[PDB]
Write a protein that binds this ligand. Structure first.
Ligand SMILES: Cc1noc(C)c1-c1cc(O)cc([C@@H](O)c2ccccc2)c1
Length: 127
């Protein structure tokens, strides 16, 4: 079956703003995760055709990935840091829902999420 369209990264009818927290999310949080040895499976949407996973989009109905997040941060899609944090959280949770505990992909997501939580605990106060 065909992949869905990816999550949107441009919509003029969506309100947005720059905040120092969103700027930290791009310059520190995304940047740090993206270069991790284990980032690559999370750097673009799941291509269920390529991966031969007929059920993926039956199971994962709110897909998200760091490719999408990167474009949203770079293209000023967000209103606040919470929208972006939620996208990370959805990406992580999706991986844990779809796969099994201790699978290599789950261990990889967990490595990224450990780093993510370290970086978010240092989120600047809004200014
Ligand atoms: C992310 C993610 N969540 O569920 C699936 C399925 C993936 C996923 C996305 C991908 O690009 C690739 C793979 C898979 O080839 C794999 C398996 C072990 C270690 C790394 C990679 C899984």
């Amino acid at each position: 079956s065909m992949n869905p369209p990816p999550p949107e990264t441009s919509n003029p009818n969506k309100p947005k703003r720059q905040t120092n927290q969103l700027q930290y999310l791009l310059r520190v949080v995304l940047k740090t995760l993206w270069k991790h040895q284990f980032a690559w499976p999370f750097q673009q949407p799941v291509d269920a055709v390529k991966l031969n996973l007929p059920d993926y989009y039956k199971i994962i109905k709110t897909p998200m990935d760091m490719g999408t997040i990167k474009k949203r941060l770079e293209n000023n899609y967000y209103w606040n840091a919470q929208e972006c944090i939620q996208d990370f959280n959805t990406m992580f949770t999706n991986c844990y829902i779809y796969n099994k505990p201790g699978d290599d992909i789950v261990l990889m997501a967990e490595a990224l999420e450990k780093l993510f939580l370290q970086k978010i605990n240092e989120l600047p106060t809004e200014e």
